[PDB]
Every structure is written in structure tokens, then in C-alpha cells.
Design a binder for this molecule. Structure first.
Ligand SMILES: CC(C)CCC[C@@H](C)[C@H]1CC[C@H]2[C@@H]3CC=C4C[C@@H](OC(=O)CCC(=O)O)CC[C@]4(C)[C@H]3CC[C@]12C
Ligand SMILES: CC(C)CCC[C@@H](C)[C@H]1CC[C@H]2[C@@H]3CC=C4C[C@@H](OC(=O)CCC(=O)O)CC[C@]4(C)[C@H]3CC[C@]12C
Ligand SMILES: CC(C)CCC[C@@H](C)[C@H]1CC[C@H]2[C@@H]3CC=C4C[C@@H](OC(=O)CCC(=O)O)CC[C@]4(C)[C@H]3CC[C@]12C
Ligand SMILES: CC(C)CCC[C@@H](C)[C@H]1CC[C@H]2[C@@H]3CC=C4C[C@@H](OC(=O)CCC(=O)O)CC[C@]4(C)[C@H]3CC[C@]12C
Ligand SMILES: CC(C)CCC[C@@H](C)[C@H]1CC[C@H]2[C@@H]3CC=C4C[C@@H](OC(=O)CCC(=O)O)CC[C@]4(C)[C@H]3CC[C@]12C
Ligand SMILES: CC(C)CCC[C@@H](C)[C@H]1CC[C@H]2[C@@H]3CC=C4C[C@@H](OC(=O)CCC(=O)O)CC[C@]4(C)[C@H]3CC[C@]12C
Ligand SMILES: CC(C)CCC[C@@H](C)[C@H]1CC[C@H]2[C@@H]3CC=C4C[C@@H](OC(=O)CCC(=O)O)CC[C@]4(C)[C@H]3CC[C@]12C
Ligand SMILES: CC(C)CCC[C@@H](C)[C@H]1CC[C@H]2[C@@H]3CC=C4C[C@@H](OC(=O)CCC(=O)O)CC[C@]4(C)[C@H]3CC[C@]12C
Ligand SMILES: CC(C)CCC[C@@H](C)[C@H]1CC[C@H]2[C@@H]3CC=C4C[C@@H](OC(=O)CCC(=O)O)CC[C@]4(C)[C@H]3CC[C@]12C
Ligand SMILES: CC(C)CCC[C@@H](C)[C@H]1CC[C@H]2[C@@H]3CC=C4C[C@@H](OC(=O)CCC(=O)O)CC[C@]4(C)[C@H]3CC[C@]12C
Lengths: 352, 103, 52, 47
């Protein structure tokens, strides 16, 4: 209802007036000197000190600052990972370690405030997994003598980066223009699962048949799974499943026995010609492609359309309900900027 | 796009130190993968080489780092699923979702 | 070789029964049922395509 | 269009189909499939 939304909005904007436009406040955020001017109307309860102190306490500005810091951390992580990586870490890597340490301290605070109910949320699990992967990567990387450990640590860090990057979707669910659309993604899992089920059934059938009627006694799991599954799956977007169904183009890539790393050859006949008939292979591939590429995708499109039409009206109140949690959680903390938070906790143990 | 490009560039090539090819590999190819062609032909070790360049003397992408025996070092069992998942997520679901919203 | 081909086609026939036996999941069955109502559109599309 | 039209009606048809499954399964002796062959083995003996 409007009353609770207005209360939450007023609490979120803090002292700043709700009527102040967003772009003005953002611009003022980048350049601090305009805080003491008419750029933004506080409309809230010597003068310069109060004007400044109140500005760095509203959760809005803290959230924006944390977003900027997260983006900078991501940029530094990428640069270090794919542009400067050596056996002995350099200063930028140490700075990255410090940033990860402060993030870990924040996560420890989150653990302390809540209990086992904390782990029921999915993003929390993702964050914990990312932190553990980062720690494992450090452990592997510190072995400078052996190179394989360095490569393994680099791979671990790359996967951890993949995990970290997706958090932008979660932290941007409050834009008021994208958040409602992000929320509705939770309601389209069943259609995807049904599509995957049908696709897998057809894929398995076609791959098994084609491998059976062409090649004999592979006895190599790698190429077995490469031919049975990979190529039919690839056929779903674009390329025809196989260029081997036609006898016109073939050979020069075969391997009698498994000496080399190439697919096993098609068995020959007494006269050294291909033995498989085309009048059954070609219709099979045509039918498979028609069934998979076209009908299934269009069906998925139709189901997505119906689901969107059904759930669009209901999505909004769910979005507001989610907005409430954000506002409350941000209002709970001390609202100190993220980089300078570490000092605060420093004295908590002293004071507690 | 950013996630996949950064990961793929990181786990294949080492210390490019050239902004041009960095942005060419991180962004351009994954974007091109959205309409048609598979994002990379480098994820598979079967076809490779003859286009590499040790150091940056020439205008070609940096080579995949080798091992003591002069063979590619990256494993395929993590690269291939990654590209498959990326293509499935981008090419199909997102476009159909856009179609539904337009309707 | 002929027997191997026959067995491959029989395998193709057998594999599709998973669709029939999974019509009771209570999450996929309803969607599987509706496939019976889309034959006419396919036939019309095929007719035009074949003419062209 | 077809999906939008038939989505509402599909459910009762699904339930009607569910009935047949339940009845057919309840009819048999419910012995596990691999060990069913023994049962019939004595039917001819007993019939
Ligand atoms: C060498 C590589 C690793 C560099 C990485 C590129 C970055 C500059 C990319 C990574 C994620 C990107 C961001 C992903 C999401 C957004 C939010 C977007 O604005 C909105 O979506 C909100 C709009 C509104 O609601 O009003 C503007 C771009 C930005 C910051 C993107 C701009 C550029 C970013 C920071
Ligand atoms: C090369 C890089 C460093 C350039 C990217 C700069 C980013 C720091 C800028 C670009 C877009 C900006 C965002 C554009 C819009 C918004 C929403 C704004 O207000 C809200 O979150 C919505 C609240 C409401 O609707 O009531 C907070 C800042 C944010 C994320 C801005 C914060 C800073 C961002 C990410
Ligand atoms: C079989 C394993 C070893 C392969 C790894 C697959 C992962 C890449 C998959 C598994 C679960 C997936 C995640 C499941 C749920 C989500 C949330 C989704 O975004 C939302 O649904 C937002 C909803 C909201 O904000 O409430 C984006 C993808 C993500 C991270 C999925 C992306 C890819 C993940 C991590
Ligand atoms: C399944 C529907 C929806 C798609 C349309 C059907 C056509 C794509 C199929 C139907 C029968 C097929 C034909 C069946 C038999 C042959 C002979 C074949 O050549 C041989 O069999 C050579 C014999 C030998 O090996 O010596 C070339 C393809 C052709 C014309 C096939 C090509 C494609 C045809 C016309
Ligand atoms: C010309 C003779 C027609 C009577 C035959 C030739 C090929 C047949 C088609 C081969 C494959 C399919 C897909 C099939 O789709 C499904 O039942 C669900 C499986 C899926 O969508 O993947 C429906 C029948 C159809 C069009 C068959 C119906 C009858 C066709 C057009
Ligand atoms: C993610 C879903 C929706 C797509 C379907 C999954 C398949 C496309 C993936 C799942 C696991 C993959 C397999 C995992 C491991 C391998 C072995 C790989 O060969 C090697 O790893 C060689 C090892 C070496 O380097 O010496 C060839 C591909 C294959 C069969 C992968 C090919 C594609 C598979 C079957
Ligand atoms: C087989 C194991 C499954 C449980 C895993 C294997 C690959 C996974 C998928 C990898 C990627 C995606 C896309 C992801 O899409 C989003 O959340 C939004 C992002 C986008 O659409 O681009 C949803 C989960 C899904 C289907 C994951 C869900 C679970 C899957 C099918
Ligand atoms: C070398 C090749 C021939 C090996 C064959 C691969 C099998 C392991 C594939 C063939 C069919 C597949 C099954 C097709 C359908 C399903 C049901 C699916 O679960 C559901 O659809 C029901 C979910 C619900 O309703 O809650 C889980 C995977 C499973 C067993 C698939 C998993 C793997 C199976 C058994
Ligand atoms: C490598 C292979 C051996 C792994 C595959 C294991 C299968 C034997 C598992 C995987 C998924 C399972 C299925 C997941 C869900 C269901 C539905 C479950 O209950 C129902 O059929 C729905 C009844 C209702 O909704 O009231 C019966 C078992 C089944 C098919 C499970 C039975 C066993 C399955 C096929
Ligand atoms: C012209 C001839 C020699 C070529 C052979 C073509 C076959 C591959 C076509 C002919 C009829 C088709 C079948 C017609 C009906 C169905 C049921 C369909 O699934 C459902 O409709 C489920 C409905 C329900 O559960 O009630 C999946 C495909 C299948 C087996 C079709 C798949 C392919 C078949 C066997």
C-alpha cells in the first residue's frame, strides 16, 4: 500500500529531500565541492559541517559508493588476472588481497548477525563458494617452485571471477526500471526443463543410431561421447549435425585403429567402398533437424509469452516486498563507507 | 559477455600486454557469437597453430602457452561446457524473452 | 551389417517411449499432452514449403 | 495462439489420463518387473 512505500522511501533517502532528482545527486556525488551549494535541496532537520556529515550517512550514497568500489575491484581483478601474473605476486595483487580481506570481514559480520538461516539464501552460498575458491587459489599459487600449481591457481581464480561477476544482477534489482523484470526470471524454470528433457531424448536417440550404423567398435570413451552427444547438441544452433552422412565428401581425416587423435573410420566392404546406405541416413538427419531446430524453439517462445502475460500483473507487489528487505538491511548497519568500515570493527573487539 | 570473455582469455593465454587484442578477444568475439558462429574455435585442441605468434612481433593473437613437452596445457573438459552454456544462455533464451516482452 | 542396422532402428523406436512413460510427473505431463493439438499448423507449413 | 487457447482445457484431460494409469497399475500383481517372470511360470501350472 502507498503508506508503507512512502515510509520506506523517506527512510531510504535519509535527510535528502525525496523531490531531489537522481542525476543531480549523482553528479554531486562525483564532485564533492558542490555539496555546499544549491545543487540538492535537503529539506530535512557550522552549517557546512552539518551539511557534509549528513551527506555521507544516507544509505543511498553509501550504496552508490559501494557499487563504484565493486566495479573498480572487478576491473583490477581482471587486469591482474589476464595482464600481469607472475610466480611472485606484485603490489596490485596485494591490494586485491586487501580488498578481498575487507569483503571477508563484511561477510563475517553478516554471519555473526544471523545464524544457520543465513545459508538458506542462494547468493550467500555463492559468495561463500567464491571466497573459498579465492583462498584455494592463493594456496595453490604460493607454490612458486612448481609451475603447474601456478596454472591451477590461475584457473581457480578465473572460475572465481566468473562466480563474482554475476552478483551485479543481484545488486541491481532496485533500479525501479530493471528490478521488476529481473524478478520474473524465477518463474521460467519449468519450460526450460521441459525443453531440455525433449531435446536430450531426441539427441540421445539420433546420436546412438548414427554412431551405430556408421562406425564399428570404437572402444574409446572420449570420441564416443564426442560423437554421440556433442555434435547433435551443436546442431541445435546452426551447423548441420554431421558432414559424414554423405559419401561425396569424406576420407583424409580417417584413422585405422586408434593410433591418432581422430574419429574412427567408416567400415569398408570387399571393394573398399563405404558400406552405409544414404537413403536412410539423410532422411534421419533431416527429420532430426526439423524436429529440434524449429518446432521446439517456437514452442518455448509461445510458453514464455504466455507465462509473461500471466505473471506481469503480479510481479510488482513481489518487487515491492523485496525492496523492503533492502531498505531495512541497509538502515541497520552503521552506514560508514565500505573502504573505511574495517577501522570501525577494529575497535568493536576492543569495546566488546 | 564480460564474464565469459575474461575467463576464456585468462585460462588460455598469458600476459598479452596489448590493449587492441585484449579488447578484440574479450568483447568482440563473444558479441559476434550472438548471431551464428561459435564464440571460439580455440577451445578445441584438434585444430590450432599456424596462426600463433610468439611475442608480439606480428599482428596475430598471442599463442596458447605450452608445457615441458611442447603441448597445449589447457584442459578441454572445463572449456567446452563453458562455451556450450554461454551459447545456450545467450543465443536462445534471451532473444525469445525479448520477443515475448515486445509482444 | 543388416542386423546391426535393424537393431539401430529398433533402438530409435524404443528410446521414444520415455516420453510416454513420463506423462505422470505432474510438472511435465500437462505440457506433453498438448502436443497432440499442433499437427494442423505443421501440415500447413509443410504444404506451403513443399510447393515453393 | 493455439497454446493460449488450449492451456485452460489441458488440465482436466491430463487428470482423465492419470486415471487410466492408476487403474492399470492397480490391476496387476505389483511384483517387481525382473521377478515377474516366475509368477506367470506357475499360472500355466495353475491354469
Ligand atoms: C577488461 C574488462 C574486464 C573491463 C570490464 C568492463 C567494465 C567497464 C564493465 C563490466 C560490467 C559493466 C557494467 C554492467 C552494468 C551496468 C549498469 C548500467 O546502468 C543500469 O543498468 C541502470 C540504469 C537505470 O536503472 O536507470 C550502466 C553500465 C554498467 C555500470 C556496466 C558498464 C561497464 C561495466 C562496469
Ligand atoms: C569506467 C567506469 C568507472 C564508468 C562507470 C561509472 C559507474 C560508477 C556509474 C555508471 C552508471 C551509474 C549508475 C546509474 C544509476 C544508478 C541508480 C541509482 O539509484 C538507484 O539505485 C535507484 C533507487 C530508486 O529508484 O529509488 C544509484 C546509482 C546507480 C547504480 C549509478 C551509480 C554509478 C554508475 C554504476
Ligand atoms: C553441473 C555444474 C558442475 C556446472 C555449473 C553450472 C553453473 C554455471 C550454473 C548452476 C546453477 C546456475 C545458477 C542458478 C540461478 C541463478 C540466478 C539467475 O538470476 C536470477 O534468477 C535472479 C532472481 C532474483 O534476483 O531473485 C542468474 C543465473 C544463476 C546464478 C544461474 C547461473 C549458472 C549456474 C551457477
Ligand atoms: C522428411 C521430410 C519432412 C523432408 C522432405 C523429404 C526429402 C528431404 C527426402 C525424402 C526422400 C529422400 C530421398 C531418398 C533417396 C535418395 C537417393 C540418394 O542416393 C542414393 O541413395 C545412392 C544409392 C547408393 O548408395 O548407391 C540421394 C538422396 C535421395 C534422393 C533422398 C534425398 C532426400 C529425400 C528426397
Ligand atoms: C511425408 C510423410 C509424413 C506423413 C511424415 C514424414 C516425416 C514425418 C514427421 C517426422 C517428425 C515429426 C516431429 C514430431 O514432433 C513431435 O511429436 C514431438 C517431438 C519434438 O518436437 O521434438 C511430430 C511428427 C513429425 C512432424 C512427423 C509427422 C509426419 C511426417 C511429416
Ligand atoms: C550443459 C548442458 C545443458 C549441455 C549438455 C552437456 C554436454 C554438451 C557436455 C556435458 C559434459 C561434457 C563432456 C565432459 C568431458 C569430455 C571429454 C573431452 O575430452 C577430453 O577431456 C580429453 C582429455 C585430455 O585433454 O587429455 C571431450 C568432451 C567430453 C565428452 C565433454 C563433451 C560435452 C559434454 C558431454
Ligand atoms: C544437467 C544439470 C542441470 C541441473 C544444469 C546444467 C546446466 C545448467 C544451466 C546453465 C545455464 C542456465 C541459464 C540460466 O539463465 C538465467 O538464470 C538468466 C541469465 C540469462 O538468461 O542469460 C538459468 C539456469 C540454466 C538453465 C542452468 C540451470 C541448470 C542446468 C541445466
Ligand atoms: C552412451 C549413451 C547411450 C548413454 C545414454 C545416456 C542416459 C544416461 C540418458 C538417456 C535418457 C536420459 C534420461 C531422460 C529423462 C530423464 C528424466 C529427468 O527427470 C525428469 O524429467 C522428471 C522431473 C520431475 O518431474 O520432477 C532426469 C534425467 C532422465 C533420467 C535422463 C537422464 C539420463 C538418461 C537416462
Ligand atoms: C546414471 C543413471 C543410472 C542415473 C539416473 C537415475 C534415475 C533412476 C533417477 C534420476 C531421476 C529420477 C526420477 C525423478 C522423479 C521421478 C517422479 C517420481 O514420482 C512420480 O512419478 C510423480 C508422481 C506424482 O506426482 O504424484 C517417480 C520416480 C521419478 C521418475 C524418479 C525415478 C528415478 C530417476 C529416473
Ligand atoms: C515415412 C516413414 C517411412 C518415415 C518414418 C517417420 C517416423 C520417424 C515418424 C512417423 C510417425 C511419427 C510419430 C507420430 C507421433 C508421435 C508421438 C509424439 O509424442 C506425443 O505426441 C505424445 C502425446 C501423448 O502422450 O499423448 C512424439 C513423436 C511420435 C512418436 C512421432 C515421431 C516420429 C514418427 C515415428
Amino acid at each position: 500500500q502507498p503508506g508503507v512505500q512512502n515510509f520506506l522511501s523517506k527512510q531510504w533517502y535519509g535527510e535528502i529531500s525525496r523531490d531531489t532528482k537522481n542525476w543531480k545527486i549523482i553528479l554531486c556525488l562525483f564532485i564533492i565541492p558542490l555539496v555546499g551549494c544549491g545543487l540538492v535541496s535537503f529539506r530535512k532537520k557550522k552549517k557546512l559541517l552539518w551539511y557534509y556529515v549528513a551527506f555521507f550517512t544516507s544509505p543511498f550514497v553509501v550504496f552508490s559508493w559501494n557499487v563504484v568500489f565493486y566495479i573498480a575491484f572487478l576491473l583490477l581483478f581482471a587486469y591482474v588476472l589476464l595482464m600481469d601474473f607472475h610466480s611472485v605476486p606484485h603490489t596490485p595483487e596485494l591490494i586485491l588481497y586487501a580488498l578481498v580481506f575487507v569483503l571477508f570481514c563484511d561477510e563475517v559480520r553478516q554471519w555473526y548477525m544471523n545464524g544457520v538461516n543465513y545459508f538458506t539464501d542462494l547468493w550467500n552460498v555463492m559468495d561463500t563458494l567464491g571466497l573459498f575458491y579465492f583462498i584455494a587459489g592463493i594456496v595453490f599459487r604460493l607454490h612458486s617452485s612448481n609451475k603447474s600449481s601456478l596454472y591451477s591457481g590461475r584457473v581457480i581464480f578465473c572460475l572465481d571471477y566468473i562466480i563474482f561477476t554475476l552478483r551485479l544482477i543481484h545488486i541491481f534489482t532496485v533500479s525501479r526500471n530493471l528490478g521488476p523484470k529481473i524478478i520474473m526470471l524465477q518463474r521460467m524454470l519449468i519450460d526450460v526443463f521441459f525443453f531440455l528433457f525433449l531435446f536430450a531424448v531426441w539427441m540421445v536417440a539420433f546420436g546412438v543410431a548414427r554412431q551405430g550404423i556408421l562406425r564399428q567398435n570404437e572402444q574409446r570413451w572420449r570420441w564416443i561421447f564426442r560423437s554421440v552427444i556433442y555434435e547433435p547438441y551443436l546442431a541445435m544452433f546452426g551447423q548441420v549435425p554431421s558432414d559424414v552422412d554423405s559419401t561425396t565428401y569424406d576420407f583424409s581425416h580417417c584413422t585405422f585403429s586408434g593410433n591418432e587423435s581422430k574419429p574412427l573410420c567408416v567400415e569398408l566392404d570387399e571393394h573398399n567402398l563405404p558400406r552405409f546406405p544414404e537413403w536412410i541416413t539423410i532422411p534421419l538427419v533431416c527429420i532430426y533437424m526439423l524436429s529440434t531446430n524449429i518446432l521446439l524453439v517456437n514452442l518455448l517462445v509461445a510458453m514464455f509469452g504466455y507465462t509473461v502475460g500471466i505473471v506481469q500483473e503480479n510481479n510488482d507487489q513481489v518487487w515491492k516486498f523485496q525492496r523492503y528487505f533492502l531498505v531495512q538491511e541497509y538502515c541497520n548497519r552503521l552506514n560508514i563507507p565500505f573502504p573505511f568500515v574495517v577501522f570501525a570493527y577494529f575497535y568493536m573487539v576492543v569495546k566488546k
